[PDB]
Design a protein around this ligand. Structure first.
Ligand SMILES: C=CC1=C(C)/C(=C/c2[nH]c(/C=C3N=C(/C=C4\NC(=O)[C@@H](C)\C4=C/C)C(C)=C\3CCC(=O)O)c(CCC(=O)O)c2C)NC1=O
Ligand SMILES: C=CC1=C(C)/C(=C/c2[nH]c(/C=C3N=C(/C=C4\NC(=O)[C@@H](C)\C4=C/C)C(C)=C\3CCC(=O)O)c(CCC(=O)O)c2C)NC1=O
Lengths: 482, 482
């Protein structure tokens, strides 16, 4: 892809986080083939001496005693001399990968998790606004994790994001309302986070633990850690966290109708480990937030659609109360404009355009119609930034930043064209977006930016976006005009 | 008809179930005001001798010690010699009402509850039909409760209901697909179940335990048990369960947008107690089902709306591509009828009615219009059983079991009328619905029916119901016809 940021193979860095141990076994005899360099933390022997040994000569008796539930369930609690660990199995590169990390210490964790689930599944949840839904999600994740700061981050259409909601303990700074470049979470990270929806960085200053040997011998590259809970993340991102002053990080993918919509991101000022089962409990909260957001958005669409049909019916009542079409459309100007949330409309019904509300002048409308008659758009054309495609109205964002045009005739230049002004938007970037990274001379090592201080820009010349309900209303009104 | 079934004051029967104890306290000194007759085994004293005594001389110290979180949270777990008990606190009739029942004994209950929550909130759980959502809810509630039979029961428009999905042990009979009279769950029960969304009948054969005294002395009537977990239910319902062969019963209200949509009903062949904590975990599943159903229904409405707008746009194009109306609408008959999912349409424009698709004859249409012209409706009229409200077409259920009519003029008999045939429906009732109860002579004591065996009827002369999207499409087409 575009950036050098996009090229780092984050699933092939060959490192795990220091609080866990990884062992990968090969074949029907379960021979140890890859092992983390710290594995004496649970094995007792130098890990290199155990490569090639079958699982029964490698793992502690306590783990072997749980082998059947581990294999059949993929996850089991094991009590080791170091304490309670969660053992996790997955498959990668033709190997069975066993990961061990400290297990949840609170027996009541799941009881607590169900209580916070009740907040997000509550009878009629989000009846205060979808902002209230986002805030409850941040608050419940903060309550369940104990992280200092929890943020709801939504990706915009160009893959840059903004913090929509924040929950944090007193005295903490935050990022509420701030925008971050698309390169802060590059394309291969977004792809990984669509498939693996959770990631914990327990200690942002800890050094990674390498795997032994550094390649899977059959493949000649490091073991694929895509599905590994212990994977050590990109060094550039660890520097980014350090530049933010963050000691530990935990994020969850928000997958809404199958696409990566955003993240819940959590920051702690000191190292902090969250158990596997507690991370999975937080995942339930994020899935519930996605479902609540979907329910509310679809309900909003249904309500908007009903309003559009009601307007079409009110306009039909007004027609045939007497008078010509032009008289009725002028008398019912507010209803005609409300069909598409517009500030003006031009109707080309055979003669000069009938201008209702705020439109460009007759000459400019006539020129736009002659241009529209050449473009290929079936029945409807819409844009929220007319000036980028139609330079004659680029300076007229006061009345024509966006248009929605519908055809009223197969070949003839007969149209209804609704108009919208620009909506200026002042946004605060977390750091200068013109300098989204600090590469070294030669552009070969790359570092994150050092500053996240607010940097203000105002976006101009773009209207509110045309909504699905606006487009349907316009198609429905074509029949009254044809 | 508010019948005898509806008048039983089920919140004032003055009894609790035998597996718990109830105590109600009055005033700043928390004097014992009401106590269940079985309370001696947990009070060490015969309960009547403790009325009027302060809570410190009534309750064991183990209860009073968590009084604060009990008042704060409404529920705590208390460990007594007889075992672990759940204490529940609510307010009724100016009294503080304390209930004690056996506590959950499985340490992993909530862990199991989260796992079934994941199945029901899977990344788009119910990805091939809401029927799959209903089955998953039945299956997960059965897994969590251990009840022999779990059914999803939906209330229809007349408050009779039907079993839409079922999960049951092998060898059980069931009620899948069967319909039950509205009087099976009478009006005051439905009202109570909208406010208190869970109820357990742990032993359908056990006798009620009376409260002492039999009235709240200040009020002269029994304590209001509307919000009591231990409330003994209507004796007629206990007889109903007996006649069904059911030994224990647990139901949860499905509240979808503030309205009682249905129930999840659970039956066991023998007595069975489900802890309060486990019931509330099942409540999460039922709230999640309601949320999933709402999300899917709203998404379906949005999709159907888009199809109607597309059809209106396609008709407008067809109208502009040349020809008389009579020619275009005949040629586009499929699309015009699809606007409202109809099988025919009559247009009362200028001359004789224009009939497209399957309609009554011209004379029957002109008989129908004059009847419509005197009916009170703003711009649209619709019914799915024309024959009841308009007998002249009761014989034309082949083409006109339902109609959707819209006005095309303020004065004058000008309409568009879409027509639908009947959809015959063969339904199985659980018992003869003409004999929904067995009253004793004098009609003063009622008993439930004795048989739930399938009793088949075929419902005729009713069309499919007219959908919100059909009404919106009809309103949107009015503009094209005026
Ligand atoms: C409040 C706003 C906010 C934002 C906007 C935010 C960003 C964020 N980035 C990441 C991850 C990564 N970033 C980069 C690369 C680069 N980052 C840059 O700045 C440039 C220099 C660059 C390359 C040229 C890579 C390769 C990864 C993948 C790491 C891996 O999985 O291996 C994560 C997930 C991890 C986590 O939860 O901590 C988050 C949540 N975290 C916040 O709280
Ligand atoms: C598969 C289908 C299916 C159905 C359709 C079904 C019905 C059902 N009824 C009830 C409750 C009550 N019924 C009646 C009265 C009458 N019942 C009759 O037949 C006539 C004679 C009559 C009066 C003339 C009253 C007063 C109550 C309130 C009890 C209380 O709360 O005190 C409940 C909730 C309790 C529970 O989950 O077990 C359910 C679930 N249970 C199933 O499984």
């Amino acid at each position: 892809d575009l950036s050098q940021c996009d090229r780092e193979p984050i699933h092939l860095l060959g490192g795990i986080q220091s609080h866990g141990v990884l062992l990968a076994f090969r074949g029907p005899d379960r021979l140890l083939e890859v092992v983390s360099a710290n594995a004496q933390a649970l094995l007792g022997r130098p890990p290199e001496t155990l490569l090639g040994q079958p699982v029964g000569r490698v793992l502690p008796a306590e783990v072997l005693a749980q082998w059947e539930p581990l294999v059949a369930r993929g996850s089991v609690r094991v009590v080791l001399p170091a304490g309670a660990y969660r053992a996790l199995l997955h498959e990668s590169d033709g190997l069975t990968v066993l990961e061990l990390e400290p297990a949840e210490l609170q027996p009541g964790m799941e009881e607590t998790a169900l209580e916070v689930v009740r907040r997000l599944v509550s009878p009629l949840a989000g009846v205060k606004g979808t902002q209230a839904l986002l805030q409850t999600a941040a608050d419940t994740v903060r309550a369940l994790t104990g992280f200092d700061r929890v943020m709801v981050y939504r990706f915009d259409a160009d893959w840059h994001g903004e913090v929509l909601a924040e929950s944090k303990r007193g005295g903490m700074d935050g990022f509420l309302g701030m925008h971050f470049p698309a390169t802060d979470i590059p394309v291969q990270a977004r792809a990984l986070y669509t498939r693996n929806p959770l990631r914990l960085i327990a200690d942002a200053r800890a050094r990674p633990v390498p795997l032994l040997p550094p390649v899977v011998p059959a493949l000649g590259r490091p073991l694929d850690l895509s599905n590994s809970a212990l994977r050590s993340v990109s060094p550039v991102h660890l520097e980014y966290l350090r530049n933010m002053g963050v000691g530990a990080s935990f994020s969850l993918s928000l997958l809404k109708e199958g696409v990566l919509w955003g993240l819940i991101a959590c920051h702690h000022l000191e190292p902090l480990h969250i158990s596997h089962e507690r991370r999975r409990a937080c995942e339930v909260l994020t899935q519930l937030l996605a479902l609540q957001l979907s329910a509310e958005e679809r309900a909003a669409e249904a309500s908007e659609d009903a309003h559009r049909a009601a307007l079409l019916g009110q306009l039909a009542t007004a027609m045939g109360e007497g008078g010509t079409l032009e008289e009725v459309l002028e008398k019912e100007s507010e209803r005609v404009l409300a069909l598409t949330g517009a500030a003006g409309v031009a109707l080309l019904l055979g003669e000069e355009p009938l201008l209702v509300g705020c439109t460009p002048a007759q000459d400019e409308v006539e020129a736009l119609v002659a241009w529209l008659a050449t473009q290929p758009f079936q029945t409807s054309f819409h844009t929220d930034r007319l000036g980028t495609v139609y330079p004659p109205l680029a300076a007229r964002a006061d009345v024509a930043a966006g248009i929605l045009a519908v055809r009223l005739a197969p070949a003839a230049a007969r149209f209804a064209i609704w108009f919208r002004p620009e909506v200026a938007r002042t946004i605060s970037w977390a750091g200068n977006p013109r300098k989204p990274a600090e590469p070294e001379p030669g552009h070969q090592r790359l570092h994150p930016r050092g500053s996240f201080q607010a940097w203000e820009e105002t976006v101009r010349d773009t209207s509110l976006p045309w909504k699905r309900a606006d487009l349907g209303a316009a198609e429905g009104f074509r029949g009254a005009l044809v």
